[PDB]
Short mmCIF file of C-alpha atoms and ligand atoms in Angstrom, two decimals:
data_model
loop_
_atom_site.label_atom_id
_atom_site.label_comp_id
_atom_site.label_asym_id
_atom_site.label_seq_id
_atom_site.Cartn_x
_atom_site.Cartn_y
_atom_site.Cartn_z
CA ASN S 724 -21.89 81.56 -25.64
CA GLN S 725 -19.89 79.79 -26.07
CA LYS S 726 -21.99 76.57 -27.13
CA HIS S 727 -24.43 79.08 -28.91
CA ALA S 728 -21.87 79.60 -31.48
CA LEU S 729 -21.07 75.53 -31.70
CA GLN S 730 -24.03 74.65 -32.29
CA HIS S 773 -8.64 82.36 -10.94
CA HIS S 774 -8.44 85.77 -9.68
CA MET S 775 -10.37 84.91 -6.83
CA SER S 776 -10.03 85.94 -3.22
CA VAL S 777 -8.51 84.86 -0.48
CA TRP S 778 -12.18 84.21 1.09
CA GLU S 779 -13.28 82.42 -2.17
CA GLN S 780 -10.30 80.08 -2.42
CA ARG S 781 -10.11 78.62 1.33
CA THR S 782 -14.73 78.35 0.41
CA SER S 783 -14.15 76.39 -2.36
CA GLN S 784 -11.35 74.36 -1.06
CA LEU S 785 -12.79 73.42 2.39
CA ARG S 786 -16.30 72.15 -0.52
CA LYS S 787 -14.17 69.78 -1.73
CA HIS S 788 -12.31 68.32 1.01
CA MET S 789 -15.96 67.98 2.69
CA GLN S 790 -17.67 65.24 0.80
CA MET S 791 -15.46 62.41 1.05
CA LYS E 163 -38.34 42.22 -54.19
CA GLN E 164 -41.81 44.61 -55.41
CA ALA E 165 -42.95 44.55 -51.81
CA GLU E 166 -42.19 47.56 -50.92
CA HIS E 167 -39.20 48.82 -53.76
CA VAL E 168 -38.56 52.09 -52.37
CA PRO E 169 -37.28 54.38 -55.03
CA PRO E 170 -33.82 55.62 -55.00
CA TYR E 171 -35.20 59.42 -56.53
CA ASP E 172 -38.10 60.89 -55.21
CA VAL E 173 -40.00 64.50 -55.81
CA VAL E 174 -39.22 67.63 -53.00
CA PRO E 175 -39.75 70.52 -53.82
CA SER E 176 -37.46 73.35 -54.18
CA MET E 177 -37.74 75.15 -51.87
CA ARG E 178 -37.90 73.27 -48.32
CA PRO E 179 -41.01 74.72 -46.86
CA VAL E 180 -40.36 75.71 -42.71
CA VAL E 181 -42.35 73.80 -40.26
CA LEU E 182 -42.19 74.81 -36.16
CA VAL E 183 -43.06 71.97 -34.04
CA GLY E 184 -42.94 71.88 -29.80
CA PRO E 185 -43.08 72.43 -27.18
CA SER E 186 -46.50 71.06 -26.42
CA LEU E 187 -49.87 70.35 -28.48
CA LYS E 188 -50.63 72.74 -31.41
CA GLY E 189 -53.81 74.79 -31.45
CA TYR E 190 -53.86 75.64 -28.27
CA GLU E 191 -53.63 78.67 -26.08
CA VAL E 192 -50.38 78.85 -25.32
CA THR E 193 -48.62 76.63 -28.12
CA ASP E 194 -50.35 78.91 -30.45
CA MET E 195 -48.54 82.39 -28.79
CA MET E 196 -45.37 80.63 -28.17
CA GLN E 197 -44.92 79.61 -31.58
CA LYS E 198 -46.12 82.62 -33.24
CA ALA E 199 -43.48 85.13 -32.30
CA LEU E 200 -40.78 83.44 -34.38
CA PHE E 201 -43.44 83.74 -37.84
CA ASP E 202 -43.90 88.15 -37.01
CA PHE E 203 -40.20 88.16 -37.43
CA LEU E 204 -40.03 86.60 -40.52
CA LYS E 205 -42.10 88.31 -42.61
CA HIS E 206 -40.34 92.19 -40.99
CA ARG E 207 -37.03 90.49 -41.75
CA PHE E 208 -37.56 88.75 -45.24
CA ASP E 209 -39.96 90.90 -46.31
CA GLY E 210 -40.39 90.87 -49.86
CA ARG E 211 -38.72 87.51 -49.77
CA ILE E 212 -41.59 85.40 -47.90
CA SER E 213 -44.63 83.56 -48.66
CA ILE E 214 -47.15 83.24 -45.88
CA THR E 215 -49.60 80.60 -45.63
CA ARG E 216 -51.67 78.13 -42.85
CA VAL E 217 -53.13 74.96 -44.11
CA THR E 218 -55.91 73.48 -41.40
CA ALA E 219 -55.86 69.90 -42.38
CA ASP E 220 -54.09 67.15 -41.48
CA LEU E 221 -50.18 66.26 -43.18
CA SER E 222 -49.81 63.09 -41.04
CA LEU E 223 -50.78 61.29 -43.72
CA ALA E 224 -49.06 62.21 -46.33
CA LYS E 225 -48.03 58.98 -48.16
CA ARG E 226 -46.72 57.71 -51.45
CA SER E 227 -47.60 54.62 -51.93
CA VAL E 228 -51.44 54.62 -51.01
CA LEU E 229 -52.99 53.38 -54.03
CA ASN E 230 -53.63 54.08 -58.28
CA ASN E 231 -56.04 56.57 -56.71
CA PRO E 232 -57.32 56.19 -53.56
CA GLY E 233 -61.41 58.71 -54.24
CA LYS E 234 -60.89 59.70 -57.93
CA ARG E 235 -64.69 60.90 -57.76
CA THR E 236 -66.89 61.70 -55.13
CA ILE E 237 -69.80 60.81 -57.83
CA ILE E 238 -68.44 57.45 -56.85
CA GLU E 239 -70.10 57.49 -53.26
CA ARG E 240 -66.73 55.21 -52.40
CA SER E 241 -64.76 55.42 -48.69
CA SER E 242 -62.22 57.85 -49.31
CA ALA E 243 -65.58 60.15 -51.35
CA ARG E 244 -67.15 61.39 -48.17
CA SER E 245 -63.42 61.20 -46.29
CA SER E 246 -61.29 63.95 -46.06
CA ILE E 247 -58.23 62.22 -48.42
CA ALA E 248 -59.60 64.23 -51.28
CA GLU E 249 -58.87 67.92 -49.69
CA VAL E 250 -55.67 66.41 -48.39
CA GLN E 251 -54.21 64.79 -51.50
CA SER E 252 -55.02 67.59 -52.87
CA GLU E 253 -53.10 70.49 -51.42
CA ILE E 254 -50.06 68.52 -51.63
CA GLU E 255 -49.77 70.08 -54.58
CA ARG E 256 -49.73 73.44 -53.82
CA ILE E 257 -46.89 73.40 -51.82
CA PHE E 258 -45.45 72.21 -53.89
CA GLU E 259 -46.03 74.54 -56.30
CA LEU E 260 -45.46 77.31 -54.04
CA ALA E 261 -41.95 75.86 -53.30
CA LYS E 262 -41.13 75.58 -57.16
CA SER E 263 -41.33 79.74 -57.50
CA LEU E 264 -37.78 79.43 -55.64
CA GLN E 265 -39.30 81.30 -52.20
CA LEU E 266 -39.65 80.41 -48.87
CA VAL E 267 -43.24 78.79 -48.01
CA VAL E 268 -43.88 78.69 -43.94
CA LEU E 269 -46.38 76.30 -42.65
CA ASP E 270 -48.39 76.61 -39.87
CA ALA E 271 -50.35 73.60 -39.79
CA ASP E 272 -52.21 72.34 -36.99
CA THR E 273 -51.68 68.38 -36.67
CA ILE E 274 -48.12 68.07 -36.05
CA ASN E 275 -46.41 68.05 -33.12
CA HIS E 276 -43.40 65.66 -33.20
CA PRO E 277 -40.90 64.53 -36.67
CA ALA E 278 -41.09 61.11 -36.98
CA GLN E 279 -45.13 62.44 -38.35
CA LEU E 280 -43.41 63.94 -41.21
CA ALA E 281 -40.20 61.53 -41.60
CA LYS E 282 -42.49 59.85 -44.77
CA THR E 283 -43.85 62.85 -46.19
CA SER E 284 -42.11 63.83 -49.83
CA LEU E 285 -42.55 67.37 -48.63
CA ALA E 286 -39.96 67.32 -45.92
CA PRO E 287 -39.71 70.83 -45.10
CA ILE E 288 -37.47 72.44 -42.02
CA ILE E 289 -37.74 71.01 -38.61
CA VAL E 290 -37.23 74.19 -36.50
CA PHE E 291 -37.87 73.31 -32.05
CA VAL E 292 -38.20 75.58 -29.60
CA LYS E 293 -38.23 74.03 -25.97
CA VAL E 294 -37.41 75.09 -22.42
CA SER E 295 -34.42 73.88 -20.94
CA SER E 296 -35.94 72.63 -18.27
CA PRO E 297 -39.99 71.10 -17.45
CA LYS E 298 -40.55 73.58 -13.91
CA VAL E 299 -40.99 76.14 -16.03
CA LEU E 300 -43.82 74.77 -17.75
CA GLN E 301 -46.19 74.38 -15.35
CA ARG E 302 -45.05 77.69 -13.98
CA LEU E 303 -45.40 79.44 -17.53
CA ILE E 304 -49.35 77.77 -17.61
CA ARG E 305 -50.17 78.70 -14.32
CA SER E 306 -50.28 82.57 -15.63
CA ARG E 307 -52.13 82.19 -18.63
CA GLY E 308 -55.42 81.45 -17.46
CA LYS E 309 -58.09 78.87 -15.73
CA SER E 310 -58.99 77.68 -19.08
CA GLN E 311 -55.27 76.58 -19.86
CA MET E 312 -54.78 74.25 -16.39
CA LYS E 313 -57.77 72.11 -17.03
CA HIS E 314 -55.71 70.93 -20.25
CA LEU E 315 -52.28 71.01 -18.14
CA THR E 316 -51.71 67.19 -18.36
CA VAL E 317 -52.42 66.49 -21.95
CA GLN E 318 -50.28 69.60 -22.40
CA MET E 319 -47.12 68.10 -20.20
CA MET E 320 -47.73 65.13 -22.25
CA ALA E 321 -46.21 65.65 -25.35
CA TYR E 322 -43.39 68.05 -23.71
CA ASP E 323 -42.09 65.19 -21.84
CA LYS E 324 -42.26 62.96 -24.69
CA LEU E 325 -41.12 65.56 -27.32
CA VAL E 326 -38.04 65.36 -25.85
CA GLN E 327 -37.48 62.15 -26.07
CA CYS E 328 -36.21 62.82 -29.88
CA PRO E 329 -33.32 62.69 -31.51
CA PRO E 330 -32.29 66.05 -31.36
CA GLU E 331 -30.67 65.15 -34.64
CA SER E 332 -33.91 64.32 -35.84
CA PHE E 333 -34.61 68.02 -36.12
CA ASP E 334 -32.96 70.59 -38.41
CA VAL E 335 -32.03 73.21 -36.34
CA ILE E 336 -32.65 74.33 -32.36
CA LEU E 337 -33.95 77.07 -30.66
CA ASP E 338 -32.67 76.84 -26.85
CA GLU E 339 -31.91 80.87 -26.14
CA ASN E 340 -34.67 81.96 -24.34
CA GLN E 341 -34.62 86.14 -25.77
CA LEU E 342 -35.41 87.48 -29.06
CA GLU E 343 -32.66 89.43 -29.99
CA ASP E 344 -30.61 86.13 -29.68
CA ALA E 345 -32.90 83.67 -31.16
CA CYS E 346 -33.33 85.95 -34.00
CA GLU E 347 -30.07 86.04 -35.54
CA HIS E 348 -29.48 83.04 -35.03
CA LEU E 349 -33.04 81.53 -36.93
CA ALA E 350 -32.04 84.47 -39.76
CA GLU E 351 -28.34 83.75 -39.73
CA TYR E 352 -29.15 79.95 -40.62
CA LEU E 353 -31.84 80.75 -42.98
CA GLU E 354 -29.72 83.42 -44.61
CA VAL E 355 -26.64 81.54 -45.59
CA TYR E 356 -29.57 79.03 -46.78
CA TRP E 357 -30.56 81.89 -49.02
CA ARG E 358 -27.71 81.54 -50.51
CA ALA E 359 -27.47 79.02 -50.99
CA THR E 360 -29.71 77.50 -53.53
CA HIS E 361 -28.42 81.13 -55.70
CA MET R 1399 -39.32 109.98 19.47
CA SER R 1400 -36.34 107.44 20.56
CA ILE R 1401 -38.46 105.43 17.94
CA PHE R 1402 -36.12 107.26 15.30
CA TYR R 1403 -33.06 106.49 17.26
CA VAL R 1404 -33.56 102.56 17.72
CA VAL R 1405 -33.96 102.34 13.84
CA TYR R 1406 -31.70 104.41 12.97
CA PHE R 1407 -29.92 102.63 15.02
CA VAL R 1408 -30.57 98.93 14.00
CA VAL R 1409 -30.06 100.76 10.12
CA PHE R 1410 -26.45 102.38 10.07
CA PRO R 1411 -24.37 101.28 12.27
CA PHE R 1412 -25.34 97.93 13.48
CA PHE R 1413 -26.11 96.77 9.58
CA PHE R 1414 -24.47 98.76 7.07
CA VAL R 1415 -20.97 98.52 9.03
CA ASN R 1416 -21.12 94.78 9.33
CA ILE R 1417 -21.94 94.79 5.51
CA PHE R 1418 -18.60 96.23 4.59
CA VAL R 1419 -16.40 94.68 6.92
CA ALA R 1420 -17.93 91.69 4.68
CA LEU R 1421 -17.88 92.89 1.51
CA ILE R 1422 -14.40 93.83 2.38
CA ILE R 1423 -13.69 90.80 4.23
CA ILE R 1424 -14.83 88.91 1.21
CA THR R 1425 -13.10 90.35 -1.60
CA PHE R 1426 -10.13 90.69 -0.51
CA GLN R 1427 -7.44 90.23 -3.47
CA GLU R 1428 -4.24 88.11 -2.37
CA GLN R 1429 -0.88 90.90 -2.51
CA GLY R 1430 1.83 89.33 -1.15
CA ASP R 1431 1.52 86.44 -4.33
CA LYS R 1432 -0.44 88.77 -6.92
CA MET R 1433 -0.16 85.42 -9.83
CA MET R 1434 -2.29 82.67 -11.14
CA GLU R 1435 -0.75 80.12 -11.62
CA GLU R 1436 0.96 79.43 -8.00
CA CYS R 1437 0.84 75.64 -7.63
CA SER R 1438 -2.28 75.44 -9.62
CA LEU R 1439 -3.58 72.06 -7.41
CA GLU R 1440 -3.75 73.72 -4.11
CA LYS R 1441 -3.06 76.91 -1.84
CA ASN R 1442 -2.14 75.81 1.63
CA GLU R 1443 0.17 72.80 1.16
CA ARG R 1444 2.57 74.87 -0.26
CA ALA R 1445 4.29 75.49 3.06
CA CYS R 1446 3.84 71.99 4.45
CA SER B 339 -9.19 97.19 22.59
CA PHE B 340 -8.01 96.96 19.06
CA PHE B 341 -5.97 94.03 18.75
CA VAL B 342 -8.94 92.06 20.36
CA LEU B 343 -11.24 92.92 18.65
CA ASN B 344 -9.26 91.81 15.47
CA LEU B 345 -8.90 88.17 17.15
CA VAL B 346 -12.74 88.51 17.82
CA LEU B 347 -13.53 89.08 13.56
CA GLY B 348 -11.03 86.97 12.36
CA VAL B 349 -12.46 84.14 14.87
CA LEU B 350 -15.75 84.75 13.86
CA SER B 351 -15.13 85.49 10.27
CA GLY B 352 -13.39 81.87 9.96
CA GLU B 353 -16.15 80.30 11.81
CA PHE B 354 -18.27 81.47 9.50
CA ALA B 355 -16.59 80.63 6.33
CA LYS B 356 -16.67 76.62 7.66
CA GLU B 357 -20.22 76.57 8.88
CA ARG B 358 -21.39 78.00 5.59
CA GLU B 359 -20.50 74.27 3.33
CA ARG B 360 -22.04 72.31 5.66
CA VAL B 361 -24.39 70.06 4.35
CA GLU B 362 -27.26 71.50 5.53
CA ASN B 363 -26.17 75.00 4.23
CA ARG B 364 -25.20 73.30 1.53
CA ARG B 365 -28.29 72.57 0.37
CA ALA B 366 -30.28 75.11 0.80
CA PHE B 367 -28.00 77.57 -1.03
CA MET B 368 -28.39 75.21 -3.82
CA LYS B 369 -32.53 75.49 -3.29
CA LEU B 370 -31.72 79.04 -3.86
CA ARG B 371 -29.64 78.65 -6.74
CA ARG B 372 -31.71 76.48 -8.42
CA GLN B 373 -35.26 78.83 -7.99
CA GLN B 374 -33.58 81.49 -9.39
CA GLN B 375 -31.98 80.23 -12.53
CA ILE B 376 -35.54 78.96 -12.66
CA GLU B 377 -36.99 82.54 -12.16
CA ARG B 378 -33.93 83.50 -14.44
CA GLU B 379 -35.16 81.38 -17.32
CA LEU B 380 -38.44 81.84 -17.15
CA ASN B 381 -37.58 85.93 -17.24
CA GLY B 382 -36.66 85.41 -20.25
CA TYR B 383 -39.76 83.21 -21.87
CA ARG B 384 -41.88 86.09 -20.82
CA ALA B 385 -41.08 88.67 -23.45
CA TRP B 386 -42.33 86.40 -26.28
CA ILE B 387 -45.48 86.06 -24.68
CA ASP B 388 -45.84 90.34 -24.75
CA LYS B 389 -43.87 90.50 -27.97
CA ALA B 390 -46.55 88.12 -30.02
CA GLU B 391 -49.17 89.43 -28.50
CA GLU B 392 -48.12 93.31 -29.40
CA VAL B 393 -48.16 92.08 -32.53
CA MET B 394 -51.16 90.33 -33.52
CA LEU B 395 -53.27 93.51 -32.17
CA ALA B 396 -51.12 95.68 -34.26
CA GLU B 397 -52.14 93.55 -37.16
CA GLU B 398 -55.25 92.80 -35.87
C1 LIG W 1501 -36.08 101.84 3.93
C2 LIG W 1501 -35.82 103.00 5.04
C3 LIG W 1501 -35.79 103.96 4.34
C4 LIG W 1501 -37.08 103.49 5.73
C5 LIG W 1501 -36.34 104.34 7.56
C6 LIG W 1501 -38.41 104.15 7.84
C7 LIG W 1501 -37.87 105.23 9.03
C8 LIG W 1501 -37.28 106.44 8.62
C9 LIG W 1501 -39.35 105.55 10.42
C10 LIG W 1501 -39.81 103.87 10.37
C11 LIG W 1501 -40.47 104.38 11.47
C12 LIG W 1501 -40.55 105.47 10.96
C13 LIG W 1501 -41.41 106.58 12.76
C14 LIG W 1501 -42.69 105.87 13.41
C15 LIG W 1501 -43.30 106.28 14.40
C16 LIG W 1501 -42.63 107.41 14.95
C17 LIG W 1501 -43.32 108.64 16.16
C18 LIG W 1501 -44.75 109.46 15.85
O1 LIG W 1501 -44.44 110.41 16.10
C19 LIG W 1501 -43.21 110.78 14.69
C20 LIG W 1501 -41.92 110.11 13.97
C21 LIG W 1501 -41.61 108.25 14.00
C22 LIG W 1501 -40.90 108.02 14.89
C23 LIG W 1501 -41.04 107.76 13.22
C24 LIG W 1501 -39.62 108.42 12.28
C25 LIG W 1501 -39.11 107.22 11.12
C26 LIG W 1501 -39.46 106.55 11.30
C27 LIG W 1501 -38.96 105.74 11.73
#
């Protein structure tokens, strides 16, 4: 929608799972 | 420098006609149905202000420096007398006068499949592209059409990839939306501002 | 008639209750901080 | 009873969170996400086909 015109309340689980993913590929 | 002598000023219609290209070869069940839904909104939204016409002949060969008079008469029995250039060359004035009335005209040819084929025509309408974000939905959409469409799926997908390679820039406007109202509003907004841009 | 009770036990106390527990677990907002940009780069190393 | 149940729940939830980020699980979830995205984009286009089809029959 922000492109059609052109032309952090996460829970503890969400934060920890997002951080666990970016530190897994390495 | 008379080999080409490209003119600086070329006669163009007063109002840009409307051409819709994509997502594959025209004249098939999927592409005729895909493109037809857009016209009905134009008729209902711009009723009393839009002219709707369908042309069956080819238009990619609409050139300006072919000859002094290619096929002037059909009684000379020349090469162009029996050819299809006589009717095609006659109808290019038909679109010119229709747009001269300061009213929009839609074009429904069954021969346009790429903006590069309409890059050498003095008519030069508005190129609007209806495209799917991914190729994976095309084959699944073809499967629901019927058994006849699956037989021509090989050629149906042939143009989809090729038409993707065309610079978006080449297209005048894009319609990457997937619903009715957003696409209808997006198309109407451009033309409504364009309608007030000519007056 | 023990089919009814087996199906009931498989559905409600074995599946729905664990659904409630999982939903509470995965949607637990932090209470002590209640802040948006505490470190904005990490969360665990703040103690470290 | 209560403390052991709390510890079991915590350990199990932590292990589930840790194991949800394995490579195979991530691949399966990405496959499911792409399937759902394709279906979502395909459903919107089907409205065009029916809306057009209704109009032409109405205008014969
Ligand atoms: C999606 C949810 C709501 C499905 C619920 C299905 C439940 C209610 C159904 C599925 C199997 C069913 C049972 C199958 C067999 C029998 C034996 C028969 O002599 C009496 C009914 C009884 C005991 C049925 C009671 C209703 C039952 C337990």
